Structure 1
Amino acid sequence: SMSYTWTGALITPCVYATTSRSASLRQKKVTFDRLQVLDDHYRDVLKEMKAKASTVKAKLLSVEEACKLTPPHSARSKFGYGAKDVRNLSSKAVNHIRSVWKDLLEDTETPIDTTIMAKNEVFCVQPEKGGRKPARLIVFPDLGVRVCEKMALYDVVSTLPQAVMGSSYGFQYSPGQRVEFLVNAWKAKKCPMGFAYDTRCFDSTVTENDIRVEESIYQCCDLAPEARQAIRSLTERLYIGGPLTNSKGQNCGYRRCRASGVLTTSCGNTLTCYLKAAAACRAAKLQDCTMLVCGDDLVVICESAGTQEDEASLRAFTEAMTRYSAPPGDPPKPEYDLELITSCSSNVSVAHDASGKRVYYLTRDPTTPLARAAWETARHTPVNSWLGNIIMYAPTLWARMILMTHFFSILLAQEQLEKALDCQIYGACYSIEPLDLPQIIQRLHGLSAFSLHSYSPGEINRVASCLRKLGVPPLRVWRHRARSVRARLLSQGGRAATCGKYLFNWAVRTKLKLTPIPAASQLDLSSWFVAGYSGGDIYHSL
């Protein structure tokens, strides 16, 4: 069937920001019929996955627990209440949620309505490698339905992926754990070869059968009867497909593929990508595979069979993925250096700690992080990508020297060091106080994140070239600015002094011997690197 059907009604509104004006261009790309052919490899992997899902015991969340996971600025319900009413457990909000839950238990077939919208994302004007990328489309059900999804499936999507995929489940890893996983996988092979596999419009390639197969995996959990019925009804009425309504309440058409804004998007995508890829690995006869899956993002590390054999095994892997309805965007290329693999937009790099000991860390091209941070300094945004980049890329040269320096100077000037800010980590929203950044960084990357040096010539040149292209002052200016930011922070004592001492130790003439932060141990990061929730409408306050 057609991934989408369009009435022609417009997807109306809610260096450059992506808008609803480019929606037509995205719609054309994501609209196609799917041809899927399953085989024995696919069926074998599925049974193996279900056998692992069978160990999971999932709990039904109470209305109250589901309400607390709702972001304060989550889209308002069309039934007369908003995210604040949900969080406060208001009568109107709660009564409506209960009527939605009751309807899921009673009605097993009627499709549930969804809103289609163009996402507003910031990208950098690259007139060299073509032009502007069209807006991604977000498809999501009403607030009432989203709270019900949490009651039925929050525990499932949070526990089942790890139980099924084990060490292959990418969302269980902090940045420090992810780099360690990739390094260990690479070092475990006699002659390693790795590749990233990019699926063209993954959500659109997800068939109705894939969504049912995905439910068959959920159904292996020990579940409460109402949770079991809610999952059965949500699959049939929402996950497999449904009608699309624009922001003006006009009918846009229909969807028979993955909705990007449902609780199960990340879990469903990860399970589907893993299933198809593990089966394709067997079809291609790739030897001693290690996979790392994050939604539609896949990395494979295996034993090289020779350069021509590897090129042949990758074409075979691609042919199998195509049969499973997961054709590629760019065709995959074998890599023989771990650093040359880009996965989840990141690459492994090496640096040294204070004692000259080798330290692996993940980095990326800083153009998009810098452009987005420039947009965020210019104007207010719901999520602060600068903060998530400081958190995730804390050991990088660019995040330490530019992002930490710039934003700490703004926070000092505005006296907003104590003001909690929202940021996204693996699709979940976190309200974070910037004064807590040293404790966060020590926990995710280790104490050495504050003492890294001997950055590679390639990394230094990529950062330096980027600054020049974007009209950002050179590294020497940042060192000078960080010294002043640091001095002001030190003079304040408490957490502010800790930010100064730890975050800006790279800036000083004579580096201080840094000791572990005592408050870092008592920091509750239990919900941080457990699962992915892209489009899942999840919130946590640290």
Structure 2
Amino acid sequence: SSMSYSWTGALITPCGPEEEKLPINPLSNSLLRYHNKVYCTTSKSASQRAKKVTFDRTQVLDAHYDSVLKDIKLAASKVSARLLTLQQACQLTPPHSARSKYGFGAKEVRSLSGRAVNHIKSVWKDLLEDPQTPIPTTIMAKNEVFCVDPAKGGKKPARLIVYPDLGVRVCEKMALYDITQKLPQAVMGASYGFQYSPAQRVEYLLKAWAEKKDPMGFSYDTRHFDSTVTERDIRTEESIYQACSLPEEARTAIHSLTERLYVGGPMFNSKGQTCGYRRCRASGVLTTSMGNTITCYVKALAACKAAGIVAPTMLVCGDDLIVISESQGTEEDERNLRAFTEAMTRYSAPPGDPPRPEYDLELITSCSSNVSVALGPRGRRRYYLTRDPTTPLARAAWETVRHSPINSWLGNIIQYAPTIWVRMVLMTHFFSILMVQDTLDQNLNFEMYGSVYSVNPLDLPAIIERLHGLDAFSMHTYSHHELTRVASALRKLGAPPLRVWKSRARAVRASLISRGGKAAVCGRYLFNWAVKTKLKLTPLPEARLLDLSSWFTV
């Protein structure tokens, strides 16, 4: 029936400057050598992405979908949600959010400047008086760094980003922020990923696996998910939102945003010319993550009933999906997954990589990560979350006039502290760089899920123990898969082999311990793996004083 996009012909032009790589990368040219392999998606490739996301969606639902949606609206009805004040919505604006056509930006929005507070006030009234006129949006290509894969066709084109004016974005937080904070948790319960730290995510999947008698898992991911979201999906989202207990003023504005913004509208490039019309999810609205995850949950759960998946346990993060279920035999499990996919395709959530039943937890990869197992020094299995380090290493090398890789490094040391590649590569290079700059004690910003938390490099032992436990400093033996991948990835980027990093780390640790104090605590805990005769590590008192609750949530 409906096309996800249609285009006028105007190019998807850049939002200001697109950085040039430099001839010397002085913070990462001692980390790896093949900098030619590290690129950034640019607005030029946006045309290629546009072709790949423009297609006719033909959705066909059934009594399983219908049934699931009923159950989810009923779960939704248990939620009560408030309007946010204009002032509170204003103050959730990030400090550098794209400015407004109306002569103000994030600085004035966050500071409750009168010109801004006024304009937003009238933007809001228009939402309650006008339930129909489309709201214009800007389309820009996303700038993200990857490592070239010639197997996957050179460089990836840039994802398409579609957002309204800053004034509108404040208004959606007034109407919908409180619901984003409560609805996903409410209708999915423990199935909602985006509430788990890496260690917690591992507990959940481990616990799921073990309570199955003959467990079987698979992961699923949708192909160009935003462009698969039908107009009917987005209104079905509105009805899910309206299931909750809401002030009538919210309901009006929620419906108005849905009809004028979420179900679609015209897009303008950064030069200002009409670019195309959109009839799918705009990745850029406040409801992007919540919409994605709830709509993915409905279809995925409907398809589970369609394919006869027995005793499913799900984990949903956007459009990434893990299902641990009871295995009906290898023969039936393959047939069931084909049914799941045939159903998901009928619902307009077609797959990228076709899913496949697996019976070993390490073999299931979703959210760009997988559980893996390492032994302690005595033989105790410890489980943990890891990933292919290729993209983290590539972003470790993105280094230009306007961007520093050092935050990237921190975020991986925090998020993947138990991994062999963080412990031996990133941690070593991180602490070597900061010592030489004599910036060990200078705060860095850790970035996760839009928020931004200040951390002091010398607090990493306490932070890591609070997040992953003391097992993060004592993984002795890693798995055949993990060793194979990390070795491969380091070769692929011209980084030294792990053998060399062990040498480098002994030096770093020496220097850390030498300067005593909190630096020496980092040397002893974070680098205990590097020395022949390991020190007995004890719990850190400061770790018990640490509230990281908000770090890995939304």
Task: Name the TM tier (shorter chain).
Answer: over 0.9
- Secondary structure at the residue paired with 1:44? helix
Structure 2 unpaired stretches of 5+: 16-37
Structure 1 residues 229 and 281 mapped into 2: Cα distance closer, same or farther (>3 Å)? Answer: same
Checking the alignment, whether the CA contact within 8 Å between 2:398 and 2:405 is kept in structure 1 is: no
Aligned counterpart in structure 1 of residue 462 of structure 2, from 434, 439, 458: 439
Per mean C-alpha deviation after superposition, the further-off stretch among 447-456 and 337-346 is 447-456
> Residue type matched to 2:146 in 1?
F
Does 1:306 find its partner at 2:329? yes
Structure 2 letter corresponding to 1:183: L
Greater shift after overlay, 481-490 or 54-63? 481-490
Q: Give the one of 474, 478, 489 matched to 1:455.
A: 478
- The answer as to 2:509 corresponding to 1:486 is yes
Separation of aligned partners in 1, 2:279 and 2:406 = 30
Letter in 1 for 2:277: Y
Q: Distance in 1 between matches of 2:378 and 2:87?
A: 50
Cα distance between partner residues in 2 of 1:384 and 1:238: 34
Q: Distance in 2 between matches of 1:152 and 1:499?
A: 45
**Aligned residue in 2 for 1:10:** 11
From 200, 205, 208, the equivalent of 2:228 is: 205
Residue type at the aligned position of 1:60:
L
Q: Aligned to 2:537, what secondary structure does the other structure show?
A: coil
Asked if the contact 1:194–1:301 (Cα under 8 Å) also holds between the matched residues in 2, the reply is yes
| 2:22 aligned partner | none
The answer to whether structure 1 residue 29 and structure 2 residue 29 are counterparts is no
Listed one character per residue, the Cα deviations across residues 204-256 of structure 1 (whole Å, up to 9, x for unaligned) are 11011111111111112222332222212111111111110111111101111
1:487–1:146 Cα change, 3 Å: farther
Matched residue, 1:334: 357
Tell me, yes or no, if structure 1 residue 270 matches structure 2 residue 293.
yes
Q: 1:320-368 deviations in whole A, cap 9, x for unaligned?
A: 1111111112221111111111111111111134554211111111111
* Kept in 1: contact 2:397–2:405 (CA 8 A): no
Match of 2:214 in 1: 191
Counterpart of 2:396 in 1: which secondary structure? helix
The reply to whether residue 344 of structure 1 matches residue 367 of structure 2 is: yes
In structure 1, list runs of 5 or more residues that go unmatched: 532-542
* Aligned equivalent of 1:123: 146
SS of 2:236's equivalent in the other structure is helix
User: Could you say which residue in structure 2 is the equivalent of 1:500?
Assistant: 523
Q: Deviations over 1:85-138 (max 9, x none)?
A: 222222222222222222222222121111111111111122244322111111
Q: What are the residue-to-residue correspondences of 1:332-481 with 2, within 5 Å?
A: 332-353=355-376, 356-376=379-399, 380-381=403-404, 384-481=407-504
Q: Which aligned pairs between 1:64-103 and structure 2 lie closer than 5 A?
A: 64-103=87-126
Q: TM-score, normalised by structure 2?
A: 0.91
> How do residues 499-518 of structure 1 correspond to structure 2 at under 5 angstroms?
499-518=522-541
Give the deviation of 1:431 after TM superposition.
Answer: 4.2
The 2-side partners of 1:332 and 1:190 are apart by 22
**CA separation of 1:73 and 1:496: change in aligned 2, threshold 3 A:** farther
Q: Tell me how far 1:168 sits from its aligned partner.
A: 0.9
**Matched residues in 2 for 1:202 and 1:462: separation?**
28
Quote the offset at 1:4 in angstroms. Answer: 0.7
What does 1:165-176 correspond to in 2, within 5 Å?
Answer: 165-176=188-199
Tell me how far 1:383 sits from its aligned partner. 9.0
RMSD after superposition: 2.0
Tell me the secondary structure at the aligned position of residue 466 of structure 1. Answer: helix
2:315 maps to 1:292: yes
Whether the 8 Å contact between 1:351 and 1:360 is mirrored in structure 2 is yes
Counterpart of 2:261? 238
Distance 1:513 1:92, change over 3 A: farther
* Identity within the alignment, %: 75
| Alignment-mate amino acid for residue 4 of structure 2 | S
